[PDB]
Amino acid sequence: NECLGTIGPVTPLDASDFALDIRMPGVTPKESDTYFCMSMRLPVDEEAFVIDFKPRASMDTVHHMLLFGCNMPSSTGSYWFCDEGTCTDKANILYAWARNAPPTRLPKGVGFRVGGETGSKYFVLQVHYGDISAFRDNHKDCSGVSVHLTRVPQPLIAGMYLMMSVDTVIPPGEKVVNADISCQYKMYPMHVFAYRVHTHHLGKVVSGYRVRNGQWTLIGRQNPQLPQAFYPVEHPVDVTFGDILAARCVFTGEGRTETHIGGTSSDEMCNLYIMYYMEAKYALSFMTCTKNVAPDMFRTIPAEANIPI
Ligand SMILES: [Cu+2]
Ligand SMILES: [Cu+2]
Ligand SMILES: [Cu+2]
């Protein structure tokens, strides 16, 4: 969007609410495929709730944008290159915008709990400039996100469920290898409202289900070779004590002359982010599954999970 000026990024809306305008401080990227970051310090030393995101992306030039909660940004400058990365501590993804992709909205009563003793103190924005054919120096970009914070305790708290395989091995050629992930859900109910799949250049399809009394209910199916936005769940799925979260990333060997789990694009990653909410009295902000606790259960995984789209 047009560049802010002197107006200031923090806007008080009342004694409970404030708005943050988190924007690049007028940047001009010189190479194609540049990653710019900046960070805003939360202006309250206490528990706040993030209850709305509005993207302020130039349709011309911004490919994807990521907003993260952490306590320690990588750099301290007004903006910096983040091929390096985002936060020194754990980066808690809050919001992922991609150019052409359905724009998910937070369900009524939902907040991301930030600040206080335990929450994030810092928002880190990350902007992917793609084709730099618009950036004929002819402009300075101020793309970013608007964020509505309240100190009012929200009845529903958002969280992030990450499922990643960490022992996977793809020999070269081997037309199909399956990374299977599965954990038994032991917490109070979560309502899954969005997912994001992330593989590197090998993965062909990634699929996530809740399985209850042997019934496979789809959470998401995506080609991981697309813009990695949070896609919206076709039917919001509850997950309950006794359920199994199961995921499968499907990988090809074809193309490789030597793969394992690592951070290098030469390495692979089978990741599924399930964004969810819980009742506030029960809410956990993060859960992880790195095991495969029920491998004999993938025997009845739906056909759809083994085929591209
Ligand atoms: Cu991008
Ligand atoms: Cu329900
Ligand atoms: Cu990766």
Resolution of the structure, angstroms = 2.8
| Residue 260 marked ligand-binding | no
* 201 among known catalytic residues: no
Q: Which ligand is nearest to the CA of 36?
A: 1
* 269 among known catalytic residues: yes
d(C-alpha 107, C-alpha 293), whole Å? 31
| Residue 198 marked ligand-binding | yes
* 128 among known catalytic residues: yes
* 198 among known catalytic residues: yes
Three-point CA angle 145, 141, 226, nearest 5°:
65
Residue tagged active-site, from 40, 128, 160, 222: 128
Residue 8 neighbours by CB under 8 Å, 6+ apart: none
CA of 33 to the centre of ligand 3 (A): 16
d(C-alpha 18, C-alpha 302), whole Å? 46
Domain borders along the chain are 1-158, 159-308
Residue tagged active-site, from 65, 126, 228, 275: 126
Give the DSSP letter string of 198-233. Answer: E--SS--EEEEEEEETTEEEEEEEE-SSS----EEE
- How was this structure determined? It was done by X-ray
Phi, psi of 192 (to 5 degrees): -75, 120
Please state whether beta strands 62-70 and 92-98 pair in parallel, antiparallel, or not at all (unpaired): antiparallel
CA of 140 to the centre of ligand 2 (A): 46
| Residue 64 marked ligand-binding | yes
